[PDB]
Amino acid sequence: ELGATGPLGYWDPLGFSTKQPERFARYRAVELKHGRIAMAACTGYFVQSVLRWPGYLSTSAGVKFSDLPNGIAGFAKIPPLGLAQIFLFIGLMEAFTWPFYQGGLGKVPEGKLPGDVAGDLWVRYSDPEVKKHKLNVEINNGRAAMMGSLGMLMHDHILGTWIPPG
Amino acid sequence: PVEYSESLPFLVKRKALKGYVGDVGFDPLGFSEILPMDWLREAELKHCRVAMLATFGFGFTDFWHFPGFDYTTLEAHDACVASGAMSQLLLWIGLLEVFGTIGIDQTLRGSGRAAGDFGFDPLGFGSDPAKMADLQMKELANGRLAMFAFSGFVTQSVLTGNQFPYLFDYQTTDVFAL
């Protein structure tokens, strides 16, 4: 019942969770994960549009942080060692730091919430109403962020810049 | 029970026009509520009668005139004001209208005289009460037509510069053409 409020209450126009309510926890975990990565990617696009790090991306290569564009071309112009380092960093952070599934697929923690991956050291609201509201805005911002991130990705794929023509 | 006008059936009846000839209820702007019906109807009949005489006289003078008056309809007023034959109408109509204002004063004070009744009926048309109401309605109809008639006469005469019909030159030909 978190996720469901707003202009549209429950909104399952194909009845996924209605047909398989046991999988609602898995779907919530996937939605939260996608929303989190989407918020990160959208903030990355907004902040790379304005601010670029000063320094060499790699001494071996001739590429600086300023020469990369902000998009698929920018990600392309990175050394393979740097790309591998990014991939393994994401792998560690998702496998040992924040594993959504305790065990296998469709095995989210029953005791914990579907997207409860933070450890003891995290911001916690000890109030049911405030916790519910903050989680609702979390998931809603995740939805908006991932729709917008798909928009940015398609715009940058087509034109090259995430911002479309005015 | 709510009364609606017979001429504007989307409005409520004024209720001040009761017991009058030509009472289709045409009074959207509510003059009867403010001014008295006797004064308003006396004015209506005065305009009706003067307009009937005016619309007949305009057309008549467009065709025939007395030997002394060799003016057209448009310049007749100025020429006769200069000659002094409009003062002779304003003096002998102003006498009539002095008696008329005494009459309308009396009927507004409640003498018994009707709105526009002077009793002037020498030839006896409508002396039967049955025909008087119908003739009053016909008088009002003809006078209210003659008001627009005279207005059209003057305006079209000045606008066209043509004598009797008051029609543009192109309107005398091909006006029924496909």
């Binding site: - | 709510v2 504007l8 989307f10 959207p28 702007l29 509510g30």
Partner: protein, 176 residues
């Protein structure tokens, strides 16, 4: 809950007696404007826009009265004003408004026993004032309002024939 907006409560004034009612009044004008006045205005704008749309389309197609300018509807206003015979369309509008709207407006404002807004009892042929024909009137009028807004702002923008689109039927039908 309003039928049109399913996350808001419909106003009490709308109820369901009026024709064209769909519970659509999110910002509740009906409390600050009398519903009869609002309905009279709605029907007046609807009727004017229906006539405007059909006249614009006819003149653009080429239906022209004799002696008038042979121009499109966009320049027809300026052409008629220049040529002169355009105040005589205001004169009947003037008498109709002054002698039917102002009295009817004050009846709606003041009189409790008055005809509803937009009802002039104008039924010469006696086709009927059913609640189907009032609903059809309202729906057609609203569609004509939106259509006239689109027609004018597209014709002024693009300066093209009847479709009022840049490409033509190709924008209405991208398959072309």
């Amino acid at each position: 809950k309003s039928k049109s907006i399913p996350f808001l409560e419909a106003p009490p004034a709308l109820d369901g007696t009026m024709a064209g009612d769909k519970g659509f009044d999110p910002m509740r004008l009906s409390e600050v404007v009398p519903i009869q006045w609002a309905r009279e205005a709605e029907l007046k704008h609807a009727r004017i826009c229906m006539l405007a749309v059909v006249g614009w389309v006819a003149v653009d197609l080429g239906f022209t009265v004799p002696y008038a300018p042979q121009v499109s509807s966009l320049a027809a206003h300026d052409a008629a004003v220049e040529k002169g015979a355009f105040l005589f369309l205001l004169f009947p509008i003037a008498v109709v408004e002054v002698l039917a709207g102002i009295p009817k407006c004050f009846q709606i404002m003041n009189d409790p026993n008055a005809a509803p807004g937009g009802d002039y009892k104008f039924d010469p042929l006696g086709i009927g004032a059913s609640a189907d024909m009032q609903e059809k009137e309202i729906s057609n009028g609203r569609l004509a309002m939106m259509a006239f807004s689109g027609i004018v702002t597209q014709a002024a923008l693009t300066q093209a024939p009847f479709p009022y689109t840049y490409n033509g039927m190709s924008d209405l039908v991208p398959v072309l």
